[PDB]
Design an enzyme around this catalytic site. Sequence first.
Site, PDB file in Angstrom:
ATOM      1  N   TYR A 175       0.850  -1.177   0.000  1.00 45.83           N
ATOM      2  CA  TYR A 175       0.000   0.000   0.000  1.00 45.83           C
ATOM      3  C   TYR A 175       0.890   1.232   0.000  1.00 45.83           C
ATOM      4  O   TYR A 175       1.929   1.256   0.667  1.00 45.83           O
ATOM      5  CB  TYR A 175      -0.933   0.027   1.211  1.00 45.83           C
ATOM      6  CG  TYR A 175      -1.758   1.292   1.301  1.00 45.83           C
ATOM      7  CD1 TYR A 175      -1.267   2.423   1.945  1.00 45.83           C
ATOM      8  CD2 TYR A 175      -3.022   1.360   0.732  1.00 45.83           C
ATOM      9  CE1 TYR A 175      -2.016   3.583   2.023  1.00 45.83           C
ATOM     10  CE2 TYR A 175      -3.778   2.516   0.806  1.00 45.83           C
ATOM     11  CZ  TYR A 175      -3.269   3.622   1.452  1.00 45.83           C
ATOM     12  OH  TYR A 175      -4.014   4.774   1.528  1.00 45.83           O
ATOM     13  N   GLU A 192      -3.545   7.614  -4.045  1.00 46.59           N
ATOM     14  CA  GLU A 192      -3.566   6.324  -3.368  1.00 46.59           C
ATOM     15  C   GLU A 192      -3.384   5.199  -4.377  1.00 46.59           C
ATOM     16  O   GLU A 192      -4.120   5.119  -5.367  1.00 46.59           O
ATOM     17  CB  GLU A 192      -4.878   6.136  -2.604  1.00 46.59           C
ATOM     18  CG  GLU A 192      -5.089   4.726  -2.072  1.00 46.59           C
ATOM     19  CD  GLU A 192      -6.360   4.596  -1.263  1.00 46.59           C
ATOM     20  OE1 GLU A 192      -6.515   5.346  -0.277  1.00 46.59           O
ATOM     21  OE2 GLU A 192      -7.208   3.751  -1.622  1.00 46.59           O
TER      22      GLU A 192
END
Lengths: 233, 204
Positions: free
Chosen positions: A120, A208
């Site tokens: 991530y 993101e």
Amino acid sequence: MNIHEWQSKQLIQKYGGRAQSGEVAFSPERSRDIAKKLWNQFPGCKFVVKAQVLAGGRGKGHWEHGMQGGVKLAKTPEEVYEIANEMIGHKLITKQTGAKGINCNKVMVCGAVKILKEFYLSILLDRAMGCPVIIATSQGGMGIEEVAQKCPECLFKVPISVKNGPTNEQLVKLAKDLGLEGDLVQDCVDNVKALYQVFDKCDSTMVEINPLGVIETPTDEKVICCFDAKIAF
Amino acid sequence: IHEWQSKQLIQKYGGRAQSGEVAFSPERSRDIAKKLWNQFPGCKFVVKAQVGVKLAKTPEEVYEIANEMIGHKNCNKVMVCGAVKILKEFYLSILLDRAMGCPVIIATSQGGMGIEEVAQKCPECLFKVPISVKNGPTNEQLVKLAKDLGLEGDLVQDCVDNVKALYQVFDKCDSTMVEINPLGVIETPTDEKVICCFDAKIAF
Ligand SMILES: Nc1ncnc2c1ncn2[C@@H]1O[C@H](COP(=O)(O)OP(=O)(O)O)[C@@H](O)[C@H]1O
Ligand SMILES: [Mg+2]
């Protein structure tokens, strides 16, 4: 996805980044044609059909009419039609919704790739700090919200200079802190550099990437690749 | 029939073939490679000059190669293909053998070479299989041909499927030759091993 956001995802590849965007389909027929066309290039490949709804845990959720999962592996273009038909025009339920239902009007048809590691990574404008900060973790599959609340020190946080942006030392160590060695270290640096170029060139509030993956190409080179990139304002 | 129409027929009848995508300009060749990087990022590309074959790493290399092909010794179009991992190259054809008065399947493990040359110097390594046009090819004949080519696992059945589809193209089009060179054993992007036709020639 408005023109402002879509023009930003494009810049990922322009600024040196590597990303899978798949292709959007607003009908199960179009979903099938996409997979069919892709089979002309990589015959026998598999596909991933992703419901396009603004909600997390898609791969976890379920559909009102029996099908399980918001992210599904498909073997053929016909299976892509079947899956996409159960998604387009139907409600998906996840943790974000309890059972209120979230209507899906489009899917991503993606080539099935071999993923070796998942990460991530996001770039946020931290208001309390007044600067950008890169947030990353190697848990990969667990999602950020879970990791942040339940694990303190699992996250890597890196404040960024507004005038200078990230530094190679900053990005190299981060690539190292994520377990990357060999050529994948520089490859990750180039991709994060590209991601920040987008973050600043577009006055973005968040960039993101989930997952940021180490994949294998059809001919088995190991490369960094961004999946399901998201940008906010 | 042209190569792009032949590969189309093979897929209709259940065969697996790489068709690539046609470009009439270097610009369009680059765009095809670009869009392909949206589905399989980092992949390589093969560029085939059409009425010779080069490996490219980027859409920009694809442009450069296509620019040296299109408009030159005369080539006026290119096929842009995703680069696929290839494990074995075979030759396979279905011919109307006049001497025997029936269709014949000819196959070799020597893919990439002209069949005239292989038979001339390696007559030992050509597999001939006459076909009873009434019952067509039997699955028994095809399983042996697959084994005799060194195929095991799911590849044996996969080969039967593709060869059966090729006979349909032969039979349905009333063709005198259906020729696959190379007929490859490839790996999909997720490493599944499957049969794939990379080139097709159909004569009348
Ligand atoms: N193109 C793809 N090829 C192969 N696997 C994929 C592909 N896209 C996603 N996946 C896998 O499926 C998972 C789907 O999850 P993701 O899209 O990240 O969000 P969610 O947690 O909401 O399901 C990914 O984490 C990855 O492991
Ligand atoms: Mg591989």
